[PDB]
DNA sequence: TTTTTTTTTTTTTTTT
């Protein structure tokens, strides 16, 4: 028999009772689906976690979906409870979903997540066939739905339908009034007639679901649509995004018929159209709510489009690196280029809610117009299939990129960022979606010229990439940070490390003195230096923090199209559901390191000589940068270009890695008893793998 | 019940049968009194004409009594005491015009009419025993109860069980 | 009060590890147990100096509790359990019940030593006729049955009180 | 005592 069935029979007739199971045999996790925790008593002092998770264990005989007790949510937060792990259940309890007629829900009250399972069989049947239903929904609570395991803007599950194709509708007997006319007469007329518009901007999803509120699929997406008489902001309400979101895209002629015109929202701004001729309507807004007969939205095909209507054409503000160099800040633009680098999918905490996160990742889009790549801060645009599976050597096109500039720092910062109404599309060979635009044709011409010339731009994927480089002087660094939180204590650092969540990144500043720096030939005369101060105070340290370890996934690795899937999966966000690995995968140490140096280990003794720490120094600058003076100092972590070397062909005479390592060690030795201000980078790679890499050493 | 009767987080008590919820045989003489008892609340006051009889001195139209059914929650945390007011008569049980003894309506959906003599089936005492037995059968069976809630003015709200769907 | 006790709380029931002399003969040392028997001897209330403070003392006295399960009596080292009314006024021919008795054993000596000792959380209760506080336990019922059998058989166990009784015998 | 941010809302009259 199966441990699942044994436990179920053991605790089936004692609902909501904590019962240690008779026998504990490891079970295999196969999925972790997240959803909102609702219908629980929030009066409790430890406010219930905002979200709860369902774990789909398997026992070799049957696989059953379990509801993890929210008290254990920290395990999923730190990615300890992965997919395909050998967890052992120490406590179990039953629970009946009164909103449904089914069986008990095995509740995992206590667990001991272990190691990976060598036998991950997804062919096992489901003990409770209700669990194996086509629409994958949460165990508890009416018509509940699942959210993306990490962020709230990524569509996830099966409710997100993608089967809305154009339909031929005859417009005879239809009025299709102009948007300006509607703006004039939306406060008097009763039956708002039809509208023929074209989507010009599609924005990310917005999850406004709150606990203990009678809300069903609380999603809203903002669409800007334009006709021959202006443009308006169209908003899709809950229960409509699931059916239409994955299908609606920019450039689709829609026929909205039964809508609701409201006064518009003052806390949300309407993006300016690419073509200024389009008159902007700001006093009006169109709300699309799900209706009984699904006719409120119709995707009119292009073939039916008549020039007589003169519908506005989807334009684009495509920009090239050279042009971007001359564009003021906050000047929206579009970028088409070749992905020559992709970074980890890091996460940041929303400033509004402490339990929500943004998923972002840095990518160096590049073109033939300049020698520097577009640095784009790619936040999730509710396009997980493209965002998660993005790889170098791909023609990438984003839609709405706000320009961000900072000239105070000596390394002038010029990186683009994705806006709310942005979009991501991967292009293939000649411009697939945007061939007509001349800039796309020029980019394709450059691609062909490079291909026939035998030149290939260097490619990288993943790694430790703290793009924003701290300024050259601590005063300028602190000009933005508050005085009370500017610095921390070497002792308090431990809590900072222990507070981060999956891929949450943090930057802290610590006051101390470099005591001993050691060089670790990383890839496959003096490498260690010790300070007399260290030899004296090493025996009187209260707590010597040891975080000078570099993980294999923090080393950027040169991309290889053949191992594309493996390389991508080694740096994406943790998948929600297990998927068996094709054949055997290679070793993450089997790929060449895009870096060009070995990592050092820096020991810092606090100003009071009581506490110490061991950070790891991971410079990303090549010796050519040293020779041409593209680095503020040898103790920094980035060259000014903030980009990896391209087709390195000039290291024949330049000092080798060992010479640069000796220079770095000597520079560190120059700071013997000097109170320096280190800038550390704390990133938690999940599964209790927190990397603490040094960024900059601000000397007096 | 004896095991989980004391650990209940909440216990609803809606097992009251208000006197105006029992159908009552119509007497032509107290026409206005009965109609005003079973019609919508007047807007303006109208003084009563004499002393009308109490509603509890009129013969009921129901053969059986009424039970107090307790429905424990599936999680053994919340209990509700609904009331049961079966409309069916012994004749219905004799000719089998009731789906089950725990149903509040008969197949005819009409009170006994032009009925002269009913002694074939035991009166409205043994039928109560049969209903109690039917409830006893479902000792620990998960069932679904269809409650018919109706607000009878003031703070009087009636919660009367309609049907007990067995697995 | 017990009357207010509801069975749904499922409060734990006061159990007891009642033991008989024959069973105690097979119990390892430091194995706490409970004893119910008939007091067939009581010794002086001797005193011993606390090892912590030189000016404090322990009040203890040896008693030979006995039952019908064996021919040898429970030798119990009864230290004071903050029950002076019972400890001071203990007499033979009384059904005696202690609560937490640690077993003490010494096999090095030829006269194998097997005597129980009162622990910190121990307790003393004198019982009357049929088990007054602990009637329900089957061992108490067996002890009462033996008492009645002895009474109706005209047999009375010899009784003693006080005297010079250095229990622990030197090897 | 401490403690912040977010959106959600459907519908049968007028003619002068």
CSV table of C-alpha atoms in Angstrom, one decimal, chain C:
chain,number,residue,atom,x,y,z
C,1,UNK,CA,-14.7,20.6,40.2
C,2,UNK,CA,-14.9,17.2,38.5
C,3,UNK,CA,-18.6,17.7,37.9
C,4,UNK,CA,-17.8,20.5,35.5
C,5,UNK,CA,-15.3,18.3,33.6
C,6,UNK,CA,-16.5,17.6,30.1
C,7,UNK,CA,-15.2,14.5,28.3
C,8,UNK,CA,-14.6,16.5,25.0
C,9,UNK,CA,-11.6,18.2,26.6
C,10,UNK,CA,-10.2,14.7,27.0
C,11,UNK,CA,-8.1,15.7,30.0
C,12,UNK,CA,-5.4,13.1,30.8
C,13,UNK,CA,-6.5,10.7,33.5
C,14,UNK,CA,-4.4,10.2,36.7
C,15,UNK,CA,-2.7,6.8,36.1
C,16,UNK,CA,-0.4,4.9,38.5
C,17,UNK,CA,2.4,2.5,38.1
C,18,UNK,CA,1.3,0.3,41.0
C,19,UNK,CA,3.8,-2.6,41.5
C,20,UNK,CA,3.9,-5.7,43.6
C,21,UNK,CA,6.9,-7.2,45.4
C,22,UNK,CA,7.3,-10.1,42.9
C,23,UNK,CA,7.3,-7.6,40.0
C,24,UNK,CA,9.7,-5.3,41.8
C,25,UNK,CA,12.1,-8.2,42.1
C,26,UNK,CA,12.4,-8.0,38.2
C,27,UNK,CA,12.6,-4.2,37.8
C,28,UNK,CA,16.0,-2.5,37.1
C,29,UNK,CA,17.2,0.2,39.4
C,30,UNK,CA,16.1,3.8,39.2
C,31,UNK,CA,12.8,2.6,37.7
C,32,UNK,CA,10.1,4.7,39.4
C,33,UNK,CA,7.1,2.7,40.7
C,34,UNK,CA,4.1,2.9,43.0
C,35,UNK,CA,3.4,0.6,46.0
C,36,UNK,CA,0.2,-0.3,47.8
C,37,UNK,CA,0.5,-2.6,50.8
C,38,UNK,CA,0.0,-3.2,54.5
C,39,UNK,CA,2.4,-1.6,56.9
C,40,UNK,CA,3.9,-4.5,58.9
C,41,UNK,CA,6.6,-2.3,60.5
C,42,UNK,CA,7.5,1.3,61.2
C,43,UNK,CA,10.9,2.7,62.3
C,44,UNK,CA,12.1,5.7,64.2
C,45,UNK,CA,12.0,9.1,62.5
C,46,UNK,CA,15.7,9.4,62.0
C,47,UNK,CA,17.4,12.5,60.6
C,48,UNK,CA,20.3,13.1,58.2
C,49,UNK,CA,22.3,16.2,57.5
C,50,UNK,CA,21.7,17.9,54.1
C,51,UNK,CA,24.8,17.7,51.9
C,52,UNK,CA,24.2,21.3,50.8
C,53,UNK,CA,23.8,23.1,54.1
C,54,UNK,CA,25.3,21.8,57.3
C,55,UNK,CA,22.5,23.1,59.5
C,56,UNK,CA,19.6,21.5,57.6
C,57,UNK,CA,18.3,17.9,57.9
C,58,UNK,CA,16.2,15.3,56.1
C,59,UNK,CA,13.6,13.5,58.1
C,60,UNK,CA,13.3,9.8,57.0
C,61,UNK,CA,12.0,6.5,58.4
C,62,UNK,CA,12.0,2.9,57.2
C,63,UNK,CA,8.7,1.1,56.7
C,64,UNK,CA,8.1,-2.5,55.6
C,65,UNK,CA,5.0,-2.2,53.4
C,66,UNK,CA,3.8,-5.7,52.5
C,67,UNK,CA,1.3,-7.5,50.2
C,68,UNK,CA,0.1,-11.0,49.4
C,69,UNK,CA,2.2,-11.3,46.3
C,70,UNK,CA,5.4,-12.4,48.1
C,71,UNK,CA,6.8,-13.3,51.5
C,72,UNK,CA,9.1,-10.3,51.6
C,73,UNK,CA,8.0,-6.7,52.4
C,74,UNK,CA,8.5,-3.5,50.5
C,75,UNK,CA,11.4,-1.8,52.2
C,76,UNK,CA,10.7,1.9,51.6
C,77,UNK,CA,13.0,4.8,52.7
C,78,UNK,CA,10.2,7.3,53.5
C,79,UNK,CA,11.6,10.8,53.5
C,80,UNK,CA,9.3,13.6,54.6
C,81,UNK,CA,6.9,14.6,51.7
C,82,UNK,CA,5.6,17.7,53.4
C,83,UNK,CA,2.8,15.6,54.9
C,84,UNK,CA,3.6,15.7,58.6
C,85,UNK,CA,0.1,14.6,59.7
C,86,UNK,CA,0.6,11.3,57.9
C,87,UNK,CA,4.3,10.9,58.1
C,88,UNK,CA,4.4,11.5,61.9
C,89,UNK,CA,1.3,9.5,62.7
C,90,UNK,CA,2.0,6.4,60.6
C,91,UNK,CA,1.3,3.1,62.3
C,92,UNK,CA,1.3,-0.6,61.3
C,93,UNK,CA,-2.0,-2.4,60.3
C,94,UNK,CA,-2.7,0.5,57.9
C,95,UNK,CA,-3.1,0.3,54.1
C,96,UNK,CA,-0.4,2.5,52.8
C,97,UNK,CA,0.0,4.0,49.3
C,98,UNK,CA,3.0,6.0,48.1
C,99,UNK,CA,3.1,7.8,44.7
C,100,UNK,CA,6.6,8.0,43.2
C,101,UNK,CA,9.1,5.4,44.5
C,102,UNK,CA,12.5,5.1,42.9
C,103,UNK,CA,13.9,1.6,42.9
C,104,UNK,CA,17.4,1.2,44.5
C,105,UNK,CA,19.4,-1.9,44.0
C,106,UNK,CA,22.9,-3.1,45.0
C,107,UNK,CA,24.1,-6.6,43.9
C,108,UNK,CA,27.7,-6.3,45.0
C,109,UNK,CA,26.8,-7.3,48.6
C,110,UNK,CA,26.0,-10.9,49.3
C,111,UNK,CA,22.7,-9.8,50.9
C,112,UNK,CA,21.3,-8.3,47.6
C,113,UNK,CA,19.8,-4.9,48.6
C,114,UNK,CA,16.4,-4.2,47.1
C,115,UNK,CA,14.7,-1.2,48.8
C,116,UNK,CA,12.6,1.6,47.3
C,117,UNK,CA,13.1,5.3,48.0
C,118,UNK,CA,10.8,8.3,47.8
C,119,UNK,CA,11.5,10.9,45.1
C,120,UNK,CA,11.1,14.6,45.0
C,121,UNK,CA,7.6,14.4,43.5
C,122,UNK,CA,6.4,11.5,45.7
C,123,UNK,CA,3.3,11.4,47.9
C,124,UNK,CA,1.9,9.4,50.8
C,125,UNK,CA,-1.7,8.4,51.4
C,126,UNK,CA,-3.2,6.1,54.0
C,127,UNK,CA,-6.1,4.0,52.7
C,128,UNK,CA,-9.1,2.6,54.5
C,129,UNK,CA,-10.6,-0.8,53.9
C,130,UNK,CA,-11.5,-1.1,50.2
C,131,UNK,CA,-9.3,1.3,48.2
C,132,UNK,CA,-10.5,4.8,49.1
C,133,UNK,CA,-8.6,7.0,46.6
C,134,UNK,CA,-7.4,4.4,44.1
C,135,UNK,CA,-10.2,1.7,44.1
C,136,UNK,CA,-10.4,1.6,40.3
C,137,UNK,CA,-6.8,0.2,39.8
C,138,UNK,CA,-6.9,-3.6,39.6
C,139,UNK,CA,-3.8,-4.0,41.8
C,140,UNK,CA,-5.6,-2.2,44.6
C,141,UNK,CA,-8.6,-4.6,44.2
C,142,UNK,CA,-6.2,-7.6,44.4
C,143,UNK,CA,-4.6,-6.1,47.5
C,144,UNK,CA,-8.0,-5.7,49.1
C,145,UNK,CA,-9.0,-9.2,48.1
C,146,UNK,CA,-5.8,-10.5,49.9
C,147,UNK,CA,-6.7,-8.4,52.9
C,148,UNK,CA,-10.1,-10.0,53.1
C,149,UNK,CA,-8.8,-13.5,52.6
C,150,UNK,CA,-6.3,-13.0,55.4
C,151,UNK,CA,-8.9,-11.6,57.7
C,152,UNK,CA,-11.4,-14.5,57.1
C,153,UNK,CA,-8.6,-17.1,57.3
C,154,UNK,CA,-7.7,-16.0,60.8
C,155,UNK,CA,-4.1,-15.1,59.8
C,156,UNK,CA,-2.5,-11.8,61.0
C,157,UNK,CA,0.9,-10.6,59.8
C,158,UNK,CA,3.2,-9.8,62.6
C,159,UNK,CA,3.5,-6.1,63.4
C,160,UNK,CA,6.3,-4.0,64.8
C,161,UNK,CA,7.0,-0.3,65.5
C,162,UNK,CA,10.1,1.7,66.3
C,163,UNK,CA,13.4,0.4,67.4
C,164,UNK,CA,17.1,0.2,66.3
C,165,UNK,CA,16.9,-0.7,62.6
C,166,UNK,CA,20.0,0.0,60.5
C,167,UNK,CA,18.5,-1.2,57.3
C,168,UNK,CA,21.5,-1.1,54.9
C,169,UNK,CA,23.5,-4.1,56.0
C,170,UNK,CA,27.3,-3.8,55.5
C,171,UNK,CA,28.7,-6.4,53.1
